[PDB]
Design a protein around this ligand. Structure first.
Ligand SMILES: [Mg+2]
Ligand SMILES: [Mg+2]
Ligand SMILES: [Mg+2]
Ligand SMILES: [Mg+2]
Ligand SMILES: [Mg+2]
Ligand SMILES: [Mg+2]
Ligand SMILES: [Mg+2]
Ligand SMILES: [Mg+2]
Ligand SMILES: [Mg+2]
Ligand SMILES: [Mg+2]
Ligand SMILES: [Mg+2]
Ligand SMILES: [Zn+2]
Lengths: 71, 129, 217, 101, 83, 25, 221, 132
RNA sequence: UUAAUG
RNA sequence: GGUUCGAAGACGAUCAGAUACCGUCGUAGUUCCGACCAUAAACGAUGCCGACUGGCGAUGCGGCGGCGUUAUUCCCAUGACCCGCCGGGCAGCUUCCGGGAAACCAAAGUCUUUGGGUUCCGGGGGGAGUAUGGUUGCAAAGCUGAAACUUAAAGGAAUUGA
């Protein structure tokens, strides 16, 4: 803490409540933008229909062809 | 400006203990400071002090020993109950064998052991060990 | 040394102090050396108090005589002013001298041939012998130091305020300290003066040596 | 990192000084930052004085001097070898070079 | 350093400086034991008993060593009270 | 790429976006 | 095999006229010879290598790799040390780390928590130790708890004989050299802290150099 | 470059330190002397050592040499150290005394002395060096 | 004065 | 109002190429007054007030004391010097106070022995000070200010090679 008064509770609580939003995990967990961008929508598993199979080329040094599915 | 006279005086005597002076002049004389010095006197961390009384904020000269490791202060004056005093002496004192946390009570300014003796909590002053 | 009529300052020592100029201090001022000065003169020269100089000489004599072994008291000089003085002081007392070229590591490095582990250091000048102070910082070694008013008191342990620049003053203070330690241990009675003359401990300018060699023959 | 305590200049309590144009370039340098050489110079250096003292009209007349306060920047000073780089212990020694010759 | 029974249970009792009233660690290699000799008042020579003084390395590297020696010697009566 | 001229190019691009938006307004 | 002594203190140790290294730690004499510790505490002394650190410097022909051995040493009652030695080969590195560790053992101070009956088991007060950014704090603990700590300072406190200690950490503790030197500085400052039990004035016994100064000049130079 | 190495120079210093009486000024004499006293395997190294011996003997005949221990020069140094004059310069009939030194000697026990002389104080206080 | 690239 | 310099622009050089560095001109501007803009490596990259813990030689202002020189000239008293004392004003040097990752800092110290009081502000690097919303401005732009997506590093100090 920086302001050490005897009655600075609303100051400390409002400052911490403002500064929690600059954390990466807190803002991602407590805004609905990440939950909207998530295809599962806050789900652990999801069923889906296969439509095509994709051969994805690999990144830097490791060079291979990974096998993916357009679900 | 000067907010906590007690904290300024105890930081002054802490710097004097760290440098190794035999005696130090702290500039204001407050009743809280004088009672704090008598509480350190009854446990024997410091020597015998004196105050210089003009008709102003007087001065205090404290004879210093080398027994005082650190003289600290807890600002502001938090309320301390008998249930919470164990947690205060847990997280502020270096050991449960020595070290003292003085806090002002209804009976008067006295350390945590005499507070346990007389069964009275109160507002915290600081710590010294 | 304290309220003792035997160890008081003597009238034959007063005139030799005034002739050597040990009261004649330096121009500048070190803050640790402020308690030994009576008053600053005109032309900016501090006066070293001779009675307190005698008291510090007495306490250094206590520190020397209290060491039982005489051989392991290190007596160090790097400047040319005290090189003869420390050698003749070691010959008179029984100590082991260091006169010029103090090798770093004589107190710390074992494999070096001159690894001496003394019990007491007697320093001629602090700025000239700052390195024996550093080895006495790592080895448990008390230190005696002939100090000026400008000379600092870093890592010294019992200093004597003197004029360490004057070649007469340095050798005269070595002579006073040598007479005092040899009167404290059972060699010399204090009623009779000592046979050896204080010009033995003085360092000679080689121009004065050539002058005396011309004037003798 | 902070290479100098006084940051290549002598401004400690000012904040702003007037600029001076350089002599070699036309660089706008702060006044305390510029390297300043007050060159004194006898108008003939070595060999012409022996001829002037013979061809002069007035007997034992002193020759004039030419006083120029040159203001160089850092790049011009190091290019014309006015100042050089130094080691990190030798940078703090701000004593001037001697005047024996 | 006793236990509940009262036994000396620590394995060494360390030294303590007589100037700053602070104990000396096990590897405070700059510490001193100044031995001040005693002088017979009628003879003026060495007796045999000593006056010892310990100073830690912090006072030496600060620069208040010989002043503390002078004060302790004046307190114990080695140096004259006039000075 | 200097950050100063990156900032200047972004100011040019913002001026172009404002010019394209004011035409639609 | 036969150790010829170089130091005066090592000569006294070879002459057995000092009874323990407790007086050496009393008078703060530097133990520069390595065989003194093998003489006194060599029966229960234990070596464990913490980590071999392959540091290297860049030269014009590639780089020169030389290994940096860390050795924790100590009998299980008080005296422990931390040796650091970097050398071209790992065997000489570990051997030099053991030698420098024997030169730099320190005793630990152990105390009580609450009730003071029995043998001391924990750190007596909240002490600290640091070098660099690594900060290691030692907390008193009740009996039978165990060293609640990281495995390497748990190993050092298990060697120290502090059976019970809560700890805290601050900084880049992955640097094991600074981490071990920080907990070493903590267990060294355990004796540097002024305990209120030590309020008794110190009656200074005679130094062994001043004790046996006749034998030290009659048996050698 | 005809520069002598350390195996020449240190061995030559040891030869001159041990056998100063035998060696001399002539190269072809003290070369054979060094051949007799020292076991030198090669003639070229022997000639280098003998030449540096001749050069150091020229240095000795000119004056004192730093890195050598000659018995005669050590005896001369011991004599010049043990030289004691007739009367001491500390014993003076007139000793110059400043007035503040007279004041501190007056506040000490030895106020009045037999052979002191209080001088006038140096008026005009200009003792510091001008700046820059 | 010119002297860019891998 | 425009002397000089000089964005844009023109010409001559250099270069494979210069729409650059170089040179010759040259508009806006640079100069004054009345209104906007509110942005800087706006830096001491170090918020403000208060207390304490080492010295040294200085400098600036003001006040005080004290051998003596130099001007008014005919002395007291005031200017210029010399040696000190005090308040803070920018600083500097010195060392194991102490701190820090170190460079370094008498503060960046009095911090795991953690609490003198009070504002603003940061939470891996980009995206991005971007979009959108609001507001200010004649405009340029100023203030507030994300997300989607992407990355296992980006960075600070210091050592050794090149
Ligand atoms: Mg750079
Ligand atoms: Mg500015
Ligand atoms: Mg033009
Ligand atoms: Mg063109
Ligand atoms: Mg152009
Ligand atoms: Mg800004
Ligand atoms: Mg800024
Ligand atoms: Mg904090
Ligand atoms: Mg971020
Ligand atoms: Mg990768
Ligand atoms: Mg940066
Ligand atoms: Zn320029």
């Amino acid at each position: 803490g920086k302001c050490r008064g005897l009655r600075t509770a609303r100051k400390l609580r409002s400052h911490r409540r403002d500064q929690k939003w600059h954390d990466k995990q807190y803002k991602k967990a407590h805004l609905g933008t990440a939950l909207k961008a998530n295809p599962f929508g806050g789900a652990s598993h999801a069923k889906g229909i296969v439509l095509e199979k994709v051969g994805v080329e690999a990144k830097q040094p490791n060079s291979a062809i990974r096998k993916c599915v357009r679900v | 400006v000067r907010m906590n006279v007690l904290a300024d005086a105890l930081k002054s005597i802490n710097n004097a203990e760290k440098r190794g002076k035999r005696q130090v002049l702290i500039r204001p004389c407050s009743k809280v400071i004088v009672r704090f010095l008598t509480v350190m006197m009854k446990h024997g961390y410091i020597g015998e002090f004196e105050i210089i009384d003009d008709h102003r904020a007087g001065k205090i000269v404290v004879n210093l020993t080398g027994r005082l490791n650190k003289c600290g202060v807890i600002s502001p004056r938090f309320d301390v109950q008998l249930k919470d005093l164990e947690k205060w002496q847990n997280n502020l004192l270096p050991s449960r064998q020595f070290g003292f946390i003085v806090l002002t009570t209804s009976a008067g300014i006295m350390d945590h052991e005499e507070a346990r003796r007389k069964h009275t909590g109160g507002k915290i002053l600081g710590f010294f060990f | 040394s304290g309220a003792l009529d035997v160890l008081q300052m003597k009238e034959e020592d007063v005139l030799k102090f005034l002739a050597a100029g040990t009261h004649l201090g330096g121009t500048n001022l070190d803050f640790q050396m402020e308690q030994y000065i009576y008053k600053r003169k005109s032309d900016g020269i501090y006066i070293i108090n001779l009675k307190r100089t005698w008291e510090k000489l007495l306490l250094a004599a206590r520190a020397i005589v209290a060491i039982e072994n005489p051989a392991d008291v290190s007596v160090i000089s790097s400047r040319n002013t005290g090189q003869r003085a420390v050698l003749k002081f070691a010959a008179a007392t029984g100590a082991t001298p260091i006169a010029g070229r103090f090798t770093p590591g004589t107190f710390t490095n074992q494999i070096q041939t001159a690894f001496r582990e003394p019990r007491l250091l007697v320093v001629t000048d602090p700025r000239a012998d700052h390195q024996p102070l550093t080895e006495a910082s790592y080895v448990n070694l008390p230190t005696i130091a002939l100090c000026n008013t400008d000379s600092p008191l870093r890592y010294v342990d019992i200093a004597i305020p003197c004029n360490n620049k004057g070649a007469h003053s340095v050798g005269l203070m070595w002579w006073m300290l040598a007479r005092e330690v040899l009167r404290m241990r059972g060699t010399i009675s204090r009623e009779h003066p000592w046979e050896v003359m204080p010009d033995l401990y003085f360092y000679r300018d080689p121009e004065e040596i050539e002058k005396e060699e011309q004037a003798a023959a | 990192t902070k290479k100098r305590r006084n940051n290549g200049r002598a401004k400690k309590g000012r904040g702003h000084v007037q600029p001076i144009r350089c002599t070699n370039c036309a660089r706008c340098v702060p006044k305390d930052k510029a390297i300043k050489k007050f060159v004194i110079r006898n108008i003939v250096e070595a060999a012409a004085v022996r001829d002037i003292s013979e061809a002069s009209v007035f007997d034992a007349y002193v020759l004039p001097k030419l006083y120029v306060k040159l203001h160089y920047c850092v790049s011009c000073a190091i290019h014309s070898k006015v100042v050089r780089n130094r080691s990190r212990e030798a940078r703090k020694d701000r004593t001037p070079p001697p005047r024996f010759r | 350093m006793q236990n509940d029974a009262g036994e000396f249970v620590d394995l060494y009792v360390p030294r303590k400086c007589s100037a700053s009233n602070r104990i000396i660690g096990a590897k405070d290699h700059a510490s001193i034991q100044m031995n001040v000799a005693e002088v017979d008042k009628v003879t003026g020579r060495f007796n045999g008993q000593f006056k010892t003084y310990a100073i830690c390395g912090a006072i030496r590297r600060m620069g208040e060593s010989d002043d503390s020696i002078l004060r302790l010697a004046k307190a114990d009566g080695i140096v004259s009270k006039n000075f | 790429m200097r950050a100063k001229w990156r900032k200047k190019r972004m100011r040019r691009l913002k001026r172009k976006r404002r010019k394209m938006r004011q035409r639609s307004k | 095999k036969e150790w010829l002594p170089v130091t005066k203190l090592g000569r006294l140790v070879k002459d057995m006229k000092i009874k323990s290294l407790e007086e050496i730690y009393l008078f703060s004499l530097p133990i520069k010879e390595s065989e003194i510790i093998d003489f006194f505490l060599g029966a229960s002394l234990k070596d464990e290598v913490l980590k071999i650190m392959p540091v290297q410097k860049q030269t014009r022909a590639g780089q020169r790799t030389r290994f940096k051995a860390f050795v924790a040493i100590g009998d299980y009652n008080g005296h422990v040390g931390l040796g650091v030695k970097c050398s071209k080969e790992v065997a000489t590195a570990i051997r030099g780390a053991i030698i420098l560790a024997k030169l730099s053992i320190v005793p630990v101070r152990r105390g009580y928590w609450g009730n003071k009956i029995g043998k001391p088991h924990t750190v007596p007060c909240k002490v600290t130790g640091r070098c660099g950014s690594v900060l290691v704090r030692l907390i008193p603990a009740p009996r039978g708890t165990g060293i609640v700590s990281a495995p390497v300072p748990k190993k050092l406190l298990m060697m120290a004989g502090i059976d019970d200690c809560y700890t805290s950490a601050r900084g880049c503790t992955a640097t094991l050299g600074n981490f071990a030197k920080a907990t070493f500085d903590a267990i060294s400052k355990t004796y540097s802290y002024l305990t209120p039990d030590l309020w008794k004035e110190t009656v200074f016994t005679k130094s062994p150099y001043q004790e046996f100064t006749d034998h030290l000049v009659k048996t050698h130079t | 470059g005809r520069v002598r190495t350390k195996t020449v120079k240190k061995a030559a210093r040891v030869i001159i330190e041990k056998y100063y009486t035998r060696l001399g000024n002539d190269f072809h004499t003290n070369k054979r002397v060094c051949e007799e006293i020292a076991i030198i395997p090669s003639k070229k190294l022997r000639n280098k050592i003998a030449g540096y011996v001749t050069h150091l003997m020229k240095r000795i005949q000119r004056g004192p040499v730093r890195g050598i221990s000659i018995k005669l020069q050590e005896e001369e140094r011991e004599r010049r150290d043990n030289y004691v004059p007739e009367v001491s310069a500390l014993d003076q009939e007139i000793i110059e005394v400043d007035p503040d030194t007279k004041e501190m000697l007056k506040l000490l026990d030895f106020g009045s002395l037999s052979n002191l002389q209080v001088t006038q104080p140096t008026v005009g206080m200009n003792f510091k060096t001008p700046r820059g």
